[PDB]
């Protein structure tokens, strides 16, 4: 589990310029969780994503992640084993490849935390499948590759560190509709099977309403709402005010509410809607 307890972070703290990107953030995520963090750009949803990895320590408040606890006085040297427990996929992760073969780049994660090359390349072998690719790719150069498959290798190299929490800033950005899809499912499958905590920063409400069990609405550095997607999406004006919106299943749901149909919950995805219309259809 992840727990923020009054976490606030100010850049250049103790300085006149100082900027407070993240203020008074308390949130809990259970084990096997799926948090989506949404909100306007530069509302500190990413200042807050870097907290988890331990790329920034809180300025005040505490964070607890399983065995781990980060406080402002935590020294970054007793935090190194957190960089593997929490695996962080950065946006456009393709610009992080650098090794000669793609197998050495994947195995690169693991080795940095101890693994001898023998079993790290062995791990790198098995990691390639997981992500999508064929064994041919193992020996190839990272740059021989397609933009889309460079990202698979990027991602897979992170999965190789065997993390218990998986943080992706923008997994599907700049990808074709199918690519976006192979991957959203890859991630759901890992969470669904093999039990993993996903943290997802998106601007795509559909991914959220369809995959998340927990949403955080970040606005201007504060935690405006937190709770289930049902909670968070059920009021729309409020969302607009924080420059967001409900997903499309819900707007269309309104159209049908406008026409005299009543739903027992506000439908957030097409499946859940179709689930209502079906039962209603039987009643017809």
């Amino acid at each position: 589990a992840i727990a923020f307890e009054h976490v606030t972070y100010t850049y250049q703290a103790g300085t006149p310029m100082a900027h407070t990107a993240l203020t008074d953030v308390s949130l809990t995520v259970p084990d096997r969780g799926y948090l989506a963090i949404i909100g306007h750009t530069g509302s500190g949803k990413s200042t807050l994503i870097q907290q988890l990895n331990a790329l920034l320590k809180p300025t005040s408040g505490t964070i607890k992640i399983d065995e781990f606890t980060i406080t402002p006085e935590t020294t970054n040297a007793a935090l190194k084993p957190l960089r593997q427990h929490v695996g962080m996929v950065f946006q456009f992760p393709e610009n992080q490849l650098f090794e000669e073969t793609v197998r050495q780049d994947i195995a690169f994660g693991p080795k940095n935390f101890g693994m001898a090359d023998a079993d790290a390349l062995a791990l790198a072998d098995e990691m390639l499948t997981t992500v999508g690719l064929d064994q041919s790719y193992a020996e190839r150069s990272p740059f021989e590759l397609s933009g889309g498959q460079m990202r698979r290798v990027a991602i897979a190299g992170v999965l190789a560190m065997q993390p218990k929490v998986l943080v992706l800033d923008e997994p599907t950005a700049g990808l074709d509709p199918q690519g976006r899809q192979e991957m959203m499912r890859l991630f759901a499958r890992l969470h669904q099977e093999q039990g993993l905590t996903i943290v997802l920063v998106t601007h795509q409400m559909e991914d959220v309403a369809q995959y998340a069990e927990q949403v955080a609405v970040m606005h201007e550095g504060r935690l405006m709402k937190f709770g289930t997607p049902a909670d968070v999406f059920s009021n729309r004006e409020w969302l607009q005010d924080h420059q967001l919106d409900v997903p499309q299943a819900a707007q269309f749901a309104r159209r049908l509410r406008d026409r005299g149909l009543t739903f027992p919950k506000q439908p957030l995805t097409a499946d859940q809607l179709a689930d209502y219309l079906a039962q209603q259809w039987a009643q017809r």
Partner: protein
């Protein structure tokens, strides 16, 4: 009044070649007058400039000690006979201070692309010698705009690298350089791939040759003040 275009460079080019000449004291009393005379107009705070100068003086001293230290020591444990260091170190420190002041006065009253278009128009001559000065202007104008973009993308690669498990700064000198590959390789490749995507874009735009540049692109009285105060100085 930083609203001075080009000359400001040629100024500080020429302000530099003045500081060495000044051997007298009745002479370069004239210097501080126009030196602080320049600073006073730009701002009255007088604090940031001194503060924003401190980091550098640790260096200038670090040098000036070397000048003085060697002569007395003689690289021989000769102690302090060090007169030359006292006058020669003193001159250095004095010199490499009036410059910094005025170069720092320049950088604080001049947006960096205003220099680049200045620098690359103080070579508005410089053609008629086979130098494609205008093309170099281009690559300069470009180099400039990518400096922030490359800097973002650099820390971005770095943090991403850290997540993987790379220790930047830790150790030395080998383990410290060895950690620089996983940032260097991508930084360059991104810049290569960056420039391939960029050149292509330029071709789509109607540019095929550097030779035709258009668009973009009071001051004398300062040079009057740097003439009726300069030539009126190498007297002493």
């Amino acid at each position: 009044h930083r609203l001075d275009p080009r000359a400001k460079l040629m100024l500080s080019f020429c302000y530099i070649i003045v500081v060495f000449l000044a051997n007298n004291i009745w002479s370069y009393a004239i210097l501080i007058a126009f030196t602080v005379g320049a600073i006073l107009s730009s701002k009255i705070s007088l604090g940031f400039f001194l503060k924003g100068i401190r980091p550098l003086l640790w260096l200038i001293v670090f040098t000036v000690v070397l000048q003085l230290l060697f002569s007395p020591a003689g690289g021989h444990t000769y102690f302090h006979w060090t007169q030359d260091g006292l006058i020669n170190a003193g001159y250095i420190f004095v010199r490499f201070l009036l410059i910094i002041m005025m170069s720092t006065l320049l950088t604080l009253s001049t947006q960096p692309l205003d220099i680049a278009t200045g620098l690359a128009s103080l070579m508005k001559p410089l053609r008629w010698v086979k130098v494609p000065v205008d093309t170099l202007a281009m690559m300069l104008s470009i180099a400039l705009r990518f400096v922030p973009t490359l800097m973002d993308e650099a820390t971005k690669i770095m943090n991403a690298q850290r997540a993987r498990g790379v220790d930047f700064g830790e150790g030395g000198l080998f383990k410290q350089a060895k950690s620089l590959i996983p940032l260097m390789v991508p930084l360059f490749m991104s810049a290569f791939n960056r420039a391939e995507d960029l050149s292509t874009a330029m071709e789509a735009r109607g540019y095929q040759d550097s030779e035709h540049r258009s668009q973009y692109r009071r001051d004398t009285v300062t040079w009057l003040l740097f003439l009726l105060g300069f030539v009126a100085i190498l007297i002493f």
